[PDB]
């Protein structure tokens, strides 16, 4: 019992209520009381990570956190936490980092009180029964096994295990069956007693801070947490601290030639520095890496990109553990960027020398402070699951009075800090690392866990001393004042066209417009969305290639101007779709039109560089022949779309028709593509109703005057339909994966076209058998790590799907799914009315809520307008229909469309095999089957 607390700092645009205090045993608690919310959550972080795992067992925090969710003392059934949780519209998730471990859940309006008492029993006293252990070792093995051929994990563990082999930073965080099961029982160590020691003696009331997102008042939640979390015993465990680095100056100035499995080219430069975590008043590292990683006139990426060596650059602070931090600059390499390495790094030290000669600056610190000041004043509220574990994770580092303003405000300027951390960046402190396919065979070392092949060569003293010769600065200069920094912020008042859902305000043959002045959030922001429908973009794989190179080359030719607006919160996305081009500009309402019109009059009046076109063409040919290495659960999802859609071009045909792309060929494509096009748009949030008309009129005006765009006749606003499977029909499509040793599958039940009464049949049956599906496939049957079951909404046709990858043969694996459908056939009928009401309630809680972020209102209004459905009020009507369904109707839906002896049954399956009737070819399949209609617009 403690009585501490004061005014938690907030934004003046906030309405949430806060209270922080400690307990008598040492747990910190932050109390958030929000009466408007619809779900509720609580989370906590234990400051023990996987860095302090026992040496004999390679990873015990991860196996403990997998074994924690099973078998609380007070509630001893295995599935009990997630069965009380998923029936009340919540789904918990947790992870384990090097120095931390989070545990977060979410729950509905009122079941928080019956959810914390299942959640505190992970910390009071767990069982750790062995029968639920021999099952979980396999699940942690299948977690590891999908990351064995993943390059961002192979480079991570080669980054770790090349340094000091004595330092604990070089340990293995995950666990396979070898280190968890096979190594100990050979050596004779019991893992059960190691779990009991590691949870009882090392896992305590300190190194642990909780948070709760409730709807109850200030006073009724404080005593709630005191009542529930006072039983956690204290041990006064010292923090697992260590002030030294893993690099003791003999692991420096070396070059790591790394052989990848994906055809990539990268350059990793690494600088070790001490902690500046105490220095968050000035935050020197963000200053310095801001001046290093900048894309603008006269910058590092501009100079290296101008001579064709690099595609991208990222520079900043790669934090390690307490005691040490890294400083990295990472570039991408072209065909000739791979063999001009030391000249690249010579330019990097030339620019660092220019930052040394210019010294510190104060107006850059003032600008970076004002940008975070306005980025905190107008702050979008995050979802409850994920906002709690964030401020429970960073709660270990700051005082209670400043937690929300931790990384969003800055104190007075410290130049000597920036000068010292800049003086740490010296050529003798380098760690260059090269990743290239071209090193194959020439490598003579292997990583113990991931099998990565690396060769270590110390860099000669001639290049280190020529990097200390780096004073010929040339064309490198500091960035100028930004002009996308907003100064105007007012809300516009609600006009007399006060609509809750956006409506048409313009419908021509040329354009079509939807507009909702935002009434909920009152932020000076705006979403704009566009679609430029064109009948040429997906005619032939050559036209898909030329579309993608047009879009990518336009995005490359504009980043020089766009990156000064990305820092100020003006975010734009340009992408190619099977229908045409998608544009979407979002951010502050001040400088929307300048960026939008610059994008338009760079999209229409656009010429090509030959050197840049060749680099983008080779990069996209690489990104096309590179997809062959992908997880086996994703080739199946790729294949279902390939078979179901009317017409689709494979990766094999795109890369084969990419050979015939030339500059004269692409030069006349762009006026052909944008000759005749229909635009459909959405824009909402703090716009005048006429300013919507202006913002569409100047778009179609600029396009029609710079590109002579003519309207598109309405017989060509066609959209693709979906293949209609025959009743009582079973189809199988097999394929082989080459890179991964696992086998994937996706089962698909076609069901029928979307309707109010079909959508709720399918979603209520998907809500019945989701948590039993996870439980009885992954917890008991131990098939695999990835398992998923739900609806599939494509082309206005519904479906039920099963996506699981595993070590087993997929023809074996389908029969487990069918026996699951028999088991839940038996379970759904022998079932009570109360728990059926719970199941039909939690769907009426998940479907009926209100998103707090304005981009999610845009992401559902636009997400429905692009479906040509226009039913802006699906939630209310459809959930109203949901309240009338009975268990009899679900057995009608099952025994007719999903049972193994059902008349109307639509069954299609793919198989992705490991490296170590039937569908032969998809044109003779889609030729002989009929096609569904299209959905009627609301």
């Amino acid at each position: 019992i403690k009585r501490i607390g004061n005014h938690i700092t907030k934004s003046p645009e906030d309405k949430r209520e806060y209270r922080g205090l400690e307990l008598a045993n040492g747990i910190k608690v932050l109390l958030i009381s929000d009466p408007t919310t619809d779900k509720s959550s609580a989370a906590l972080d234990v400051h023990i990570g996987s860095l302090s795992d026992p040496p004999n067992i390679a990873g015990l925090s991860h196996f403990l956190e997998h074994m924690l969710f099973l078998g609380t003392k007070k509630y001893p059934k295995e599935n009990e936490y997630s069965q009380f949780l998923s029936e009340h519209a919540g789904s918990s998730n947790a992870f384990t980092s090097g120095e931390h471990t989070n545990y977060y859940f979410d729950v509905s309006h009122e079941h928080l009180e019956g959810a914390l008492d299942r959640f505190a029993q992970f910390f009071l006293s767990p069982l750790f029964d062995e029968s639920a252990k021999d099952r979980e070792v396999n699940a942690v093995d299948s977690e590891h096994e999908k990351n064995v051929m993943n390059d961002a994990w192979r480079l991570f563990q080669l980054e770790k295990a090349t340094g000091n082999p004595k330092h604990p930073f070089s340990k293995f965080g995950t666990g396979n069956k070898y280190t968890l099961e096979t190594r100990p029982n050979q050596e004779g160590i019991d893992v059960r007693q190691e779990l009991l020691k590691f949870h009882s003696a090392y896992y305590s009331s300190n190194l642990m801070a909780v948070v709760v997102l409730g709807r109850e008042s200030l006073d009724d939640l404080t005593n709630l947490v005191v009542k529930l979390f006072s039983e956690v015993e204290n041990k006064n465990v010292p923090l697992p601290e260590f002030p030294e680095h893993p690099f003791q100056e003999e692991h420096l100035k070396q070059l790591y030639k790394i052989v990848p499995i994906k055809d990539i080219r990268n350059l990793y430069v690494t600088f070790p520095i001490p902690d500046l975590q105490k220095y968050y008043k000035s935050n020197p590292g963000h200053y310095l890496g801001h001046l290093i990683g900048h894309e603008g006139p006269g910058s590092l990426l501009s100079e290296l990109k101008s001579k064709g060596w690099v595609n991208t650059l990222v520079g900043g602070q790669k934090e390690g553990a307490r005691g040490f931090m890294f400083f990295i600059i990472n570039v991408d390499l072209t065909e000739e960027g791979l063999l001009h390495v030391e000249d690249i790094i010579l330019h990097m030290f030339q620019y660092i020398q220019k930052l040394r000669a210019e010294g510190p600056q104060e107006w850059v610190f003032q600008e970076l402070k004002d940008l975070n000041a306005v980025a905190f004043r107008f702050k979008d509220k995050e979802r409850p699951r994920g906002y709690t574990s964030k401020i429970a994770g960073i709660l270990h580092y700051y005082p209670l009075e400043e937690v929300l303003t931790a990384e969003y405000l800055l104190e007075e300027f410290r130049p000597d800090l920036i000068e010292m951390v800049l003086d740490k960046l010296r050529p003798e402190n380098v760690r260059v690392a090269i990743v290239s396919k071209s090193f194959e065979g020439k490598t003579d070392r292997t990583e113990e866990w991931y099998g990565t092949q690396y060769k270590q060569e110390a860099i000669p003293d001639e290049v280190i001393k020529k990097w200390q010769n780096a004073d010929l600065n040339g064309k490198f200069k500091l960035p100028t004042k930004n002009e996308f920094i907003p100064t105007n912020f007012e809300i516009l008042p609600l006009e007399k066209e006060a609509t809750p859902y956006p409506a048409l305000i313009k419908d021509t043959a040329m354009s079509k417009l939807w507009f909702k002045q935002d009434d909920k959030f009152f932020l000076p922001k705006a979403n704009l969305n566009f679609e430029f429908f064109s009948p040429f973009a997906y005619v032939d794989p050559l036209h898909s290639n030329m579309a993608y190179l047009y879009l990518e080359l336009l995005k490359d030719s504009l980043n020089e101007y766009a990156y000064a607006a990305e820092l100020a919160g003006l975010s734009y996305d340009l992408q190619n779709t099977i229908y045409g081009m998608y544009l979407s500009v979002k951010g502050y309402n001040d400088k929307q039109p300048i960026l939008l019109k610059k994008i338009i009059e760079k999209m229409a009046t656009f010429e090509i560089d030959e050197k840049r076109f060749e680099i983008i063409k080779e990069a996209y040919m690489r990104s096309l022949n590179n997809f062959r290495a992908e997880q086996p659960h994703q080739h199946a999802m790729y294949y279902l779309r390939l078979l179901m859609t009317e017409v689709a071009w494979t990766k094999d045909e795109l890369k084969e028709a990419l050979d015939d792309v030339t500059l004269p060929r692409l030069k006349a494509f762009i006026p052909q593509l944008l000759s005749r096009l229909h635009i459909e748009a959405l824009l909402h949030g703090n716009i005048t109703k006429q300013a919507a008309l202006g913002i569409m009129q100047m778009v179609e005006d600029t396009l029609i005057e710079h590109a002579h765009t003519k309207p598109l006749l309405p017989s060509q606003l066609v959209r693709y339909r979906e293949v209609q499977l025959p009743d009582r029909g079973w189809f199988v499509y097999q394929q082989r994966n080459e890179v991964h040793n696992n086998s994937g599958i996706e089962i698909y039940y076609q069901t029928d076209m979307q309707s109010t009464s079909e959508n709720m049949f399918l979603e209520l049956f998907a809500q019945i058998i989701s948590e039993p599906a996870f439980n009885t496939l992954r917890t008991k049957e131990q098939l695999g790590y990835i398992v998923f079951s739900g609806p599939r909404r494509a082309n206005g046709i519904q479906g039920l799907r099963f996506i699981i990858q595993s070590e087993k043969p997929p023809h074996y694996l389908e029969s487990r799914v069918e026996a699951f459908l028999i088991t839940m056939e038996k379970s759904i009928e022998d079932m009570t009315e109360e728990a059926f009401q719970k199941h039909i309630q939690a769907l009426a809680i998940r479907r009926l809520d209100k998103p707090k972020k304005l981009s999610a209102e845009s992401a559902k209004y636009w997400g429905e307008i692009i479906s040509q459905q226009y039913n802006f009020d699906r939630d209310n009507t459809e959930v109203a229909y949901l309240k009338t369904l009975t268990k009899e109707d679900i057995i009608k839906f099952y025994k007719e469309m999903l049972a193994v002896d059902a008349p109307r049954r639509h069954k299609v399956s793919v198989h992705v095999l490991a490296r170590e009737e039937v569908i032969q070819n998809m044109t003779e399949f889609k030729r002989g089957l009929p096609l569904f209609p299209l959905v009627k617009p609301h």
Binding site: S50, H62, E65, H66, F69, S91, N93, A94, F95, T96, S97, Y104, E143, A152, W153, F156, G173, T174, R385, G386, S389, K390, G393, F774, R778, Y785, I786, F788
Partner: peptide
């Protein structure tokens, strides 16, 4: 919510 790009999440929810 898996702040780091590398993920050790108990389950993948999609």
């Amino acid at each position: 919510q898996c702040c780091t790009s590398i993920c050790s999440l108990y389950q993948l929810e999609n």
